[PDB]
Coordinates of C-alpha atoms and ligand atoms in Angstrom, one line a residue:
Chain A
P5 CA 72.7 139.0 101.8
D6 CA 72.0 136.8 104.8
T7 CA 68.5 136.2 103.4
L8 CA 67.5 132.5 103.3
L9 CA 64.5 133.0 101.0
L10 CA 63.7 129.8 99.1
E11 CA 60.8 131.0 97.0
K12 CA 63.1 132.3 94.2
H13 CA 65.0 129.0 94.4
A14 CA 62.0 126.8 93.7
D15 CA 61.2 129.0 90.8
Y16 CA 64.7 128.5 89.4
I17 CA 64.4 124.7 89.4
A18 CA 60.9 124.6 87.8
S19 CA 61.9 127.1 85.1
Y20 CA 65.3 125.4 84.4
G21 CA 63.7 122.9 82.1
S22 CA 62.1 125.6 80.0
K23 CA 65.3 127.0 78.7
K24 CA 65.7 126.1 75.0
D25 CA 69.1 124.4 74.9
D26 CA 68.3 121.4 72.7
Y27 CA 72.0 120.6 72.5
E28 CA 73.1 121.1 76.1
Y29 CA 70.8 118.6 77.8
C30 CA 71.6 116.2 74.9
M31 CA 75.1 115.7 76.1
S32 CA 74.0 115.2 79.7
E33 CA 71.4 112.7 78.7
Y34 CA 73.5 110.0 80.3
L35 CA 72.8 111.5 83.7
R36 CA 69.2 112.8 83.3
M37 CA 67.7 110.1 85.5
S38 CA 69.9 111.3 88.4
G39 CA 69.5 114.8 87.2
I40 CA 65.7 114.5 87.6
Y41 CA 66.1 112.9 91.0
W42 CA 68.3 115.8 92.0
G43 CA 65.8 118.6 91.0
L44 CA 63.0 116.6 92.5
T45 CA 64.4 115.9 95.9
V46 CA 64.9 119.6 96.9
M47 CA 61.5 120.7 95.6
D48 CA 60.3 118.0 98.1
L49 CA 62.7 119.5 100.7
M50 CA 61.2 122.9 100.1
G51 CA 57.7 121.6 99.9
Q52 CA 57.4 122.5 96.2
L53 CA 57.5 119.0 94.7
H54 CA 54.1 119.8 93.1
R55 CA 55.7 122.3 90.8
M56 CA 57.3 119.4 88.9
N57 CA 55.5 117.3 86.4
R58 CA 55.0 113.9 88.1
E59 CA 53.1 112.1 85.4
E60 CA 55.6 112.7 82.7
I61 CA 58.4 111.5 85.0
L62 CA 56.6 108.3 86.0
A63 CA 56.2 107.4 82.3
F64 CA 59.9 108.3 81.7
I65 CA 61.1 105.9 84.4
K66 CA 58.9 103.0 83.2
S67 CA 60.3 103.5 79.7
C68 CA 63.8 103.3 81.2
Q69 CA 63.5 99.8 82.7
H70 CA 64.9 97.1 80.5
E71 CA 64.1 93.4 80.2
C72 CA 67.0 92.5 82.5
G73 CA 65.4 94.6 85.2
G74 CA 68.0 97.4 85.2
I75 CA 67.1 101.0 84.6
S76 CA 68.8 103.4 82.1
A77 CA 69.7 107.1 82.7
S78 CA 67.4 107.8 79.7
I79 CA 65.3 106.1 77.1
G80 CA 67.5 104.2 74.7
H81 CA 70.5 104.1 77.0
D82 CA 72.0 101.0 78.6
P83 CA 70.8 100.1 82.1
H84 CA 73.2 100.8 84.9
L85 CA 73.2 100.4 88.7
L86 CA 73.7 104.1 89.3
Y87 CA 70.6 105.2 87.5
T88 CA 68.7 102.2 88.9
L89 CA 69.2 103.8 92.3
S90 CA 68.1 107.3 91.1
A91 CA 65.0 105.9 89.5
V92 CA 64.0 104.0 92.7
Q93 CA 64.7 107.1 94.8
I94 CA 62.3 109.1 92.6
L95 CA 59.6 106.5 92.7
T96 CA 59.9 106.5 96.5
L97 CA 59.2 110.2 96.6
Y98 CA 56.0 109.7 94.6
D99 CA 54.8 106.8 96.8
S100 CA 54.8 104.6 93.7
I101 CA 57.6 102.0 93.3
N102 CA 55.1 99.6 91.7
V103 CA 55.3 101.7 88.6
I104 CA 58.2 99.5 87.5
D105 CA 58.8 95.7 87.9
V106 CA 60.0 95.5 91.5
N107 CA 61.2 91.9 91.3
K108 CA 63.3 92.4 88.2
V109 CA 65.1 95.3 89.7
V110 CA 65.9 93.1 92.7
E111 CA 66.9 90.3 90.3
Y112 CA 69.1 92.8 88.3
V113 CA 70.9 94.1 91.4
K114 CA 71.4 90.7 92.9
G115 CA 73.0 89.4 89.7
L116 CA 75.6 92.2 89.9
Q117 CA 77.3 90.8 93.0
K118 CA 80.6 88.9 92.8
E119 CA 81.9 86.1 94.9
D120 CA 84.1 88.5 97.0
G121 CA 80.9 90.4 97.9
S122 CA 81.7 93.3 95.6
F123 CA 79.2 94.9 93.2
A124 CA 79.6 95.8 89.5
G125 CA 78.0 98.8 87.8
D126 CA 76.7 97.0 84.8
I127 CA 77.1 93.6 83.0
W128 CA 80.5 94.7 81.9
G129 CA 81.7 94.2 85.5
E130 CA 83.3 97.5 86.6
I131 CA 84.1 97.2 90.3
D132 CA 83.6 100.1 92.7
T133 CA 82.3 100.7 96.3
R134 CA 79.9 103.2 94.8
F135 CA 78.1 100.2 93.3
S136 CA 78.2 98.5 96.6
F137 CA 76.3 101.5 98.0
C138 CA 74.0 101.8 95.0
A139 CA 73.1 98.1 95.4
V140 CA 72.3 98.1 99.1
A141 CA 70.4 101.5 99.0
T142 CA 68.2 100.4 96.1
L143 CA 67.3 97.1 97.8
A144 CA 66.7 99.0 101.1
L145 CA 64.1 101.2 99.4
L146 CA 62.6 98.1 97.9
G147 CA 62.6 96.2 101.2
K148 CA 64.5 93.3 99.6
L149 CA 68.0 93.7 101.2
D150 CA 68.3 90.1 102.2
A151 CA 68.0 89.2 98.5
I152 CA 71.8 89.4 98.4
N153 CA 74.7 88.0 100.5
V154 CA 75.0 90.9 102.9
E155 CA 77.9 89.3 104.8
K156 CA 80.3 89.2 101.8
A157 CA 79.1 92.6 100.7
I158 CA 80.1 94.1 104.1
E159 CA 83.3 92.1 104.0
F160 CA 84.4 93.6 100.7
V161 CA 83.6 97.2 101.7
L162 CA 85.6 96.8 104.9
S163 CA 88.5 95.5 102.8
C164 CA 88.5 98.9 101.0
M165 CA 89.2 100.7 104.3
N166 CA 92.6 102.3 104.0
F167 CA 95.1 103.3 106.7
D168 CA 93.7 106.8 106.7
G169 CA 90.5 105.4 108.0
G170 CA 89.0 106.5 104.7
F171 CA 87.7 104.3 101.8
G172 CA 88.5 103.8 98.2
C173 CA 86.8 102.4 95.1
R174 CA 88.6 99.1 95.1
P175 CA 91.0 97.5 97.7
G176 CA 94.3 99.3 97.7
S177 CA 92.9 102.5 96.1
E178 CA 93.3 105.9 97.7
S179 CA 90.9 107.2 100.4
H180 CA 88.4 109.6 98.8
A181 CA 85.4 111.5 100.1
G182 CA 83.1 110.2 97.4
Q183 CA 84.0 106.7 98.3
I184 CA 83.7 107.4 102.0
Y185 CA 80.2 108.7 101.5
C186 CA 79.2 105.5 99.7
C187 CA 80.9 103.2 102.2
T188 CA 79.7 105.0 105.3
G189 CA 76.2 104.9 103.8
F190 CA 76.8 101.3 103.0
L191 CA 77.7 100.5 106.6
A192 CA 74.7 102.6 107.8
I193 CA 72.2 100.5 106.0
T194 CA 73.9 97.2 106.9
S195 CA 73.9 98.2 110.5
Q196 CA 77.7 97.9 110.6
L197 CA 78.7 101.4 111.7
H198 CA 80.7 100.2 114.6
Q199 CA 83.2 98.6 112.2
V200 CA 84.5 102.0 111.3
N201 CA 86.5 104.3 113.6
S202 CA 84.1 107.3 114.1
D203 CA 86.8 109.4 115.7
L204 CA 89.6 108.6 113.2
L205 CA 87.5 109.0 110.1
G206 CA 85.9 112.1 111.6
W207 CA 89.3 113.7 111.9
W208 CA 90.1 112.8 108.3
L209 CA 87.0 114.4 106.9
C210 CA 87.3 117.7 108.8
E211 CA 90.9 118.0 107.8
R212 CA 90.3 117.3 104.2
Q213 CA 89.3 120.1 101.8
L214 CA 89.4 120.6 98.0
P215 CA 82.5 120.0 91.3
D216 CA 83.4 120.9 94.9
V217 CA 79.9 120.7 96.5
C218 CA 80.1 117.0 95.7
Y219 CA 83.1 117.0 98.0
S220 CA 81.3 119.4 100.3
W221 CA 78.1 117.3 100.6
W222 CA 80.1 114.0 100.8
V223 CA 82.0 115.4 103.9
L224 CA 78.9 116.8 105.6
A225 CA 76.6 113.8 105.0
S226 CA 79.3 111.3 106.1
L227 CA 79.9 113.2 109.4
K228 CA 76.2 113.1 110.0
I229 CA 76.2 109.4 109.4
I230 CA 79.3 109.0 111.6
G231 CA 77.7 111.0 114.5
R232 CA 80.7 113.3 114.8
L233 CA 79.2 116.2 112.8
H234 CA 79.8 118.9 115.5
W235 CA 83.5 118.8 114.8
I236 CA 82.9 121.4 112.1
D237 CA 81.6 125.0 112.5
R238 CA 78.0 125.1 111.6
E239 CA 77.5 128.9 111.3
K240 CA 80.6 129.7 109.4
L241 CA 79.7 127.2 106.7
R242 CA 76.0 128.2 106.5
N243 CA 76.9 131.8 105.5
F244 CA 79.5 130.5 103.1
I245 CA 76.8 128.3 101.4
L246 CA 74.5 131.4 101.1
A247 CA 77.4 133.0 99.2
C248 CA 77.3 130.3 96.6
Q249 CA 73.7 131.4 95.8
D250 CA 72.7 133.4 92.8
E251 CA 70.7 136.5 93.8
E252 CA 69.5 137.0 90.2
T253 CA 68.7 133.5 88.8
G254 CA 68.8 131.3 91.9
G255 CA 70.4 127.9 92.8
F256 CA 73.9 127.0 94.0
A257 CA 77.2 126.9 92.3
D258 CA 80.4 125.1 93.4
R259 CA 82.0 128.4 94.3
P260 CA 80.6 131.9 94.9
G261 CA 80.4 133.6 91.5
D262 CA 80.2 130.5 89.3
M263 CA 77.6 129.0 87.1
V264 CA 74.7 127.5 89.0
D265 CA 73.3 124.0 88.3
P266 CA 70.4 121.9 89.8
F267 CA 73.0 119.4 91.1
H268 CA 75.1 121.7 93.3
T269 CA 71.8 123.5 94.2
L270 CA 70.8 120.4 96.1
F271 CA 73.6 120.1 98.6
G272 CA 73.3 123.9 99.0
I273 CA 69.7 123.3 100.1
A274 CA 70.4 119.8 101.5
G275 CA 73.6 120.9 103.3
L276 CA 71.7 123.6 105.2
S277 CA 69.1 121.0 106.2
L278 CA 71.9 119.0 107.8
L279 CA 73.3 122.1 109.4
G280 CA 70.0 122.6 111.2
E281 CA 67.9 124.8 108.9
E282 CA 64.2 125.3 110.0
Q283 CA 62.8 126.4 106.7
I284 CA 64.0 123.3 105.0
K285 CA 62.8 119.7 105.7
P286 CA 65.2 117.4 107.6
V287 CA 67.2 115.7 105.0
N288 CA 68.6 112.2 105.3
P289 CA 72.4 112.0 104.8
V290 CA 72.3 108.4 103.4
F291 CA 69.5 108.5 100.8
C292 CA 69.7 112.3 100.3
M293 CA 65.9 112.4 100.7
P294 CA 63.4 114.1 103.1
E295 CA 63.1 112.1 106.3
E296 CA 59.3 112.3 105.9
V297 CA 59.4 110.1 102.8
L298 CA 61.3 107.3 104.5
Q299 CA 58.2 106.6 106.6
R300 CA 55.3 104.8 104.9
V301 CA 51.9 103.3 106.1
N302 CA 51.2 100.5 103.7
Chain B
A6 CA 61.1 116.3 54.0
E7 CA 64.2 117.4 52.2
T8 CA 65.7 119.1 55.2
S9 CA 65.8 115.8 57.1
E10 CA 67.6 114.3 54.1
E11 CA 70.0 117.3 53.7
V12 CA 71.2 116.9 57.3
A13 CA 71.6 113.2 56.7
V14 CA 74.1 114.0 53.9
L15 CA 75.8 116.7 55.9
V16 CA 76.4 114.5 58.9
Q17 CA 77.6 111.6 56.6
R18 CA 80.0 114.2 55.1
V19 CA 81.5 115.6 58.2
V20 CA 82.2 112.3 59.9
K21 CA 84.3 111.3 56.9
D22 CA 86.1 114.6 57.1
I23 CA 87.3 113.4 60.5
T24 CA 87.9 109.8 59.2
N25 CA 90.1 111.1 56.4
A26 CA 91.7 113.5 58.9
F27 CA 93.2 110.5 60.8
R28 CA 94.2 109.0 57.4
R29 CA 96.1 112.1 56.3
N30 CA 97.8 112.2 59.7
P31 CA 97.9 109.1 62.0
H32 CA 99.9 111.1 64.6
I33 CA 97.2 113.2 66.3
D34 CA 98.3 114.7 69.7
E35 CA 95.1 116.2 70.9
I36 CA 91.5 117.1 70.1
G37 CA 90.1 120.6 70.4
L38 CA 87.0 122.7 69.8
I39 CA 87.5 126.0 68.0
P40 CA 84.8 128.7 68.7
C41 CA 82.8 129.5 65.5
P42 CA 79.1 130.7 66.0
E43 CA 78.0 130.3 62.4
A44 CA 79.2 128.2 59.5
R45 CA 81.3 129.4 56.5
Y46 CA 80.0 128.4 53.1
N47 CA 82.9 126.6 51.5
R48 CA 84.5 125.6 54.7
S49 CA 84.4 122.3 56.6
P50 CA 84.0 122.5 60.4
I51 CA 86.9 120.1 60.7
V52 CA 90.1 122.2 60.9
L53 CA 93.5 120.3 61.0
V54 CA 96.9 121.7 62.0
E55 CA 100.1 119.7 61.9
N56 CA 99.1 117.4 64.8
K57 CA 95.9 118.7 66.2
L58 CA 92.4 118.7 64.7
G59 CA 89.6 121.0 65.9
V60 CA 85.8 121.2 65.4
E61 CA 83.9 124.5 64.9
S62 CA 81.4 125.1 67.7
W63 CA 78.4 125.4 65.3
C64 CA 78.8 121.8 64.1
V65 CA 78.3 120.4 67.6
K66 CA 75.2 122.5 68.1
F67 CA 73.5 121.0 65.1
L68 CA 75.0 117.6 64.3
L69 CA 75.8 116.2 67.8
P70 CA 72.1 115.5 68.6
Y71 CA 71.7 113.9 65.2
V72 CA 74.5 111.3 65.9
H73 CA 73.2 111.0 69.4
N74 CA 69.7 110.2 68.4
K75 CA 70.8 107.9 65.6
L76 CA 72.7 105.7 68.1
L77 CA 69.6 105.5 70.3
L78 CA 67.6 104.4 67.3
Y79 CA 70.0 101.5 67.0
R80 CA 69.6 100.6 70.7
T81 CA 65.8 100.6 70.5
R82 CA 66.0 98.6 67.3
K83 CA 64.1 101.2 65.2
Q84 CA 67.0 101.9 62.8
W85 CA 69.9 99.5 62.3
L86 CA 73.4 100.6 61.6
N87 CA 76.2 99.1 59.6
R88 CA 79.6 98.0 61.1
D89 CA 81.4 101.0 59.8
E90 CA 78.5 103.2 60.8
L91 CA 78.6 102.0 64.4
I92 CA 82.4 102.6 64.7
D93 CA 81.9 106.0 63.2
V94 CA 79.0 107.3 65.4
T95 CA 80.5 106.1 68.6
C96 CA 83.9 107.5 67.7
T97 CA 82.3 111.0 67.0
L98 CA 80.1 110.8 70.1
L99 CA 83.0 109.9 72.4
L100 CA 85.4 112.4 70.9
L101 CA 83.0 115.0 72.2
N102 CA 81.3 113.3 75.1
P103 CA 83.6 110.6 76.6
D104 CA 81.2 110.0 79.5
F105 CA 78.5 108.6 77.2
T106 CA 78.5 105.2 78.8
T107 CA 76.1 103.6 76.2
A108 CA 78.4 104.7 73.3
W109 CA 81.3 102.9 75.1
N110 CA 79.2 99.7 75.6
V111 CA 78.5 99.6 71.8
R112 CA 82.2 99.4 71.1
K113 CA 82.5 96.7 73.7
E114 CA 79.9 94.6 71.7
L115 CA 81.9 95.3 68.5
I116 CA 85.3 94.5 70.0
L117 CA 84.6 90.9 71.0
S118 CA 82.4 90.4 67.9
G119 CA 85.6 90.7 65.8
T120 CA 84.0 93.9 64.4
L121 CA 86.3 96.4 66.1
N122 CA 90.0 96.3 66.9
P123 CA 90.6 96.7 70.7
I124 CA 93.8 98.6 70.0
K125 CA 91.7 101.4 68.4
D126 CA 89.8 101.9 71.7
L127 CA 93.2 102.3 73.4
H128 CA 94.0 105.0 70.9
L129 CA 90.5 106.5 71.0
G130 CA 90.5 106.6 74.8
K131 CA 94.0 108.0 74.8
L132 CA 92.8 111.0 72.8
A133 CA 89.8 111.6 75.1
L134 CA 92.2 111.7 78.1
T135 CA 94.2 114.5 76.4
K136 CA 91.0 116.6 76.7
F137 CA 89.1 115.0 79.6
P138 CA 91.8 113.4 81.9
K139 CA 89.2 113.0 84.7
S140 CA 86.5 111.3 82.6
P141 CA 85.5 108.2 84.6
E142 CA 83.9 106.2 81.7
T143 CA 87.0 106.6 79.6
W144 CA 89.1 104.9 82.3
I145 CA 86.3 102.4 83.1
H146 CA 86.1 101.3 79.5
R147 CA 89.9 101.1 79.1
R148 CA 90.0 98.6 82.0
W149 CA 87.5 96.4 80.2
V150 CA 89.5 96.6 77.0
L151 CA 92.7 95.7 78.9
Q152 CA 91.0 92.6 80.4
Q153 CA 90.2 91.4 76.8
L154 CA 93.8 91.7 75.6
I155 CA 95.4 89.6 78.3
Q156 CA 92.5 87.2 78.4
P157 CA 104.1 88.3 82.0
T158 CA 104.1 88.0 78.2
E159 CA 106.2 90.5 76.1
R160 CA 103.0 92.0 74.7
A161 CA 101.7 92.2 78.2
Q162 CA 104.7 94.1 79.5
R163 CA 104.6 96.4 76.5
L164 CA 100.9 97.0 77.2
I165 CA 101.5 98.0 80.9
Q166 CA 104.3 100.5 79.9
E167 CA 101.8 102.1 77.6
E168 CA 99.3 102.4 80.4
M169 CA 102.1 103.9 82.6
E170 CA 102.7 106.7 80.1
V171 CA 99.0 107.6 79.8
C172 CA 98.8 107.6 83.6
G173 CA 101.7 110.0 83.8
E174 CA 100.2 112.5 81.3
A175 CA 96.8 112.3 82.8
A176 CA 98.4 113.1 86.2
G177 CA 100.1 116.1 84.7
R178 CA 97.1 117.7 83.1
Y179 CA 95.5 117.8 86.6
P180 CA 97.0 117.5 90.1
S181 CA 95.8 114.6 92.3
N182 CA 93.8 112.9 89.4
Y183 CA 92.1 110.2 91.5
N184 CA 90.8 108.3 88.5
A185 CA 94.1 108.4 86.7
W186 CA 96.0 107.0 89.7
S187 CA 93.4 104.4 90.7
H188 CA 93.6 103.1 87.1
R189 CA 97.4 102.9 87.4
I190 CA 97.0 100.9 90.6
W191 CA 94.4 98.6 88.9
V192 CA 96.9 97.9 86.1
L193 CA 99.5 96.6 88.5
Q194 CA 97.0 94.4 90.3
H195 CA 95.4 92.7 87.3
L196 CA 97.8 93.1 84.3
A197 CA 101.1 92.9 86.3
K198 CA 99.8 90.9 89.3
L199 CA 102.2 92.8 91.5
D200 CA 105.3 91.6 89.6
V201 CA 108.2 92.8 91.7
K202 CA 110.3 93.7 88.7
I203 CA 107.8 96.3 87.5
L204 CA 107.2 97.6 91.0
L205 CA 110.9 98.5 91.5
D206 CA 111.0 100.2 88.1
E207 CA 107.9 102.3 89.1
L208 CA 109.6 103.4 92.3
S209 CA 112.6 104.6 90.4
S210 CA 110.6 106.3 87.7
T211 CA 108.4 108.2 90.0
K212 CA 111.2 109.8 92.0
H213 CA 111.6 112.8 89.8
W214 CA 107.8 113.3 89.6
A215 CA 107.4 113.2 93.4
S216 CA 110.1 115.8 93.7
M217 CA 108.3 118.2 91.4
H218 CA 104.7 117.3 92.3
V219 CA 104.6 117.9 96.0
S220 CA 101.1 118.2 97.7
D221 CA 100.0 115.5 95.4
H222 CA 98.5 113.0 97.9
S223 CA 97.2 110.9 95.1
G224 CA 100.7 110.4 93.5
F225 CA 102.2 109.6 96.9
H226 CA 99.5 107.0 97.6
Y227 CA 100.9 105.2 94.5
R228 CA 104.3 105.3 96.2
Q229 CA 102.8 103.8 99.3
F230 CA 101.0 101.2 97.2
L231 CA 104.3 100.1 95.6
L232 CA 105.9 99.6 98.9
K233 CA 102.9 97.8 100.5
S234 CA 102.9 95.4 97.5
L235 CA 106.6 94.7 97.6
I236 CA 106.2 93.8 101.3
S237 CA 103.2 91.5 100.5
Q238 CA 105.1 89.9 97.6
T239 CA 107.8 88.7 100.0
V240 CA 106.3 86.3 102.6
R241 CA 117.5 89.9 96.3
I242 CA 115.6 93.0 97.5
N243 CA 116.6 94.6 100.8
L244 CA 113.0 95.3 102.0
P245 CA 113.9 97.4 105.1
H246 CA 116.4 99.5 103.0
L247 CA 113.5 100.6 100.8
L248 CA 111.8 102.0 103.8
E249 CA 115.1 103.6 104.9
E250 CA 115.4 105.3 101.5
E251 CA 111.8 106.4 101.4
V252 CA 111.9 108.1 104.9
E253 CA 115.1 109.9 103.9
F254 CA 113.7 110.9 100.5
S255 CA 110.6 112.3 102.3
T256 CA 112.8 114.3 104.7
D257 CA 114.9 115.8 101.9
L258 CA 111.7 117.1 100.2
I259 CA 110.4 118.6 103.5
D260 CA 113.8 120.4 104.0
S261 CA 113.5 121.7 100.4
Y262 CA 109.7 122.3 100.4
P263 CA 108.4 122.8 103.9
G264 CA 104.8 123.5 104.8
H265 CA 103.4 120.7 102.7
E266 CA 101.2 118.6 105.0
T267 CA 100.5 115.8 102.5
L268 CA 104.2 115.2 102.2
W269 CA 104.5 115.0 106.0
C270 CA 101.7 112.5 106.3
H271 CA 103.3 110.3 103.7
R272 CA 106.5 109.9 105.8
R273 CA 104.2 109.2 108.8
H274 CA 102.8 106.2 106.9
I275 CA 106.3 104.9 106.1
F276 CA 107.0 104.9 109.8
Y277 CA 104.0 102.6 110.3
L278 CA 105.4 100.2 107.6
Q279 CA 108.6 100.0 109.6
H280 CA 106.8 99.2 112.8
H281 CA 104.9 96.5 111.0
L282 CA 108.0 94.5 110.1
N283 CA 109.0 94.6 113.8
Ligands
LIG403 MG1 56.2 110.6 101.3

């Protein structure tokens, strides 16, 4: 119903890794680093991070950093920028980034930037604005953002801004919500949010509609970053999100009545935290983390 | 004990059942997965019709994590693999899980070591797109391969045409396939370098598609990209006339299929291109 009970949601996440599907998580092992960060960030949002095994995750992350500094999605996989971000985000939640070699991660990210300011995913040089965001975000959490040429980085992302006001992966590519989420987040960290038309882009996001909660989170989070979030109906969306829930098992699916996964479960929980939920910690739209974590003492 | 040795023989056997499947039939349209909970005694999990081969579901439940783990043993330098072994394990892993990035990276290391033929990955990736037309890594890897083939020649122009056909099919299996169109754009920018001859042929070849595939904002962006490039390549072809024809072509589609907002915004952008030349 209209119940916003999260106790059965936290139980779902913690008991999701107990299901004996030795084959199923074997195919998704190329995402398990992000998959872990996913499940972890909402347990922290619900204040149930303690129901997840921290020690076994810290060991897993340290075993995923390679000699080049990069971090894999899992042990034995090739290091990528995507799962370098996820790993750093996790270690930030646990107040322990010194688990891994901080300098080498910076060194690895720095050596992925091109002369046009763009960033590559791995050593094989795939160009995308997602990697531009993954780079700046990782360095931000490390406190080593000036380790790269920020100017050229900003220059390249702005060059991916299409006529729609939206952003693409590479210059000339179509405007997409996923790319907008990265680029808006990119400009947010680089303190260059004035470079984008808050009104034009806002009208784009609200008008655009369709994994659909990817799309849903990317729209919601961007609007929060933009500052023009109120241009969408809060209440009508909140109840719609509660419909994507699973009254039996728990978690969120992409659509009401579909299979639920930890991934879409986040932005179900994280989305509501952007809508103004009281029972859920204030989530950050950029880093997709609890705002409480983004403040340290030493 | 013996069980770990039995599965080693079984896996070695079934991967050759697929290898010899491509040998009995080079022309393989697609790759499927037939539902079969438990194995049949004298029956191989690899079933082959005239142009399509499928794999029984039980095989993947047992043997996929074996091939998966064996590749990780190679990456951790705990168990080395031969040349033919590496091109077999990656081939099987990517025929079922195209988003396995590490598996793609292995073939990259083989391609430029003279171990693996780059053309094979174009064929391999082509099969994966017939089942997973959205798969990012398949497109990402393909771009890497294409950069190794060129580094326009006749072979270069043949290569681009091949990429155009696999971008048309991948756009047909799913509407507004972002990764399939963004790859098509990438080809024109890097392999064609915005050659005006190809750009004109693309406008003429996507006319029929645009008529059928309305509400495809991704496909129409390709149209906008072709026009924007032709403008940038001229700083022979009546440049304003192309904008005249496009705004009229947009109107005829609105008159025929009204209510489509993506189609309306497309013409709105063509108007901007006309004011830019002013
Ligand atoms: Mg904290």
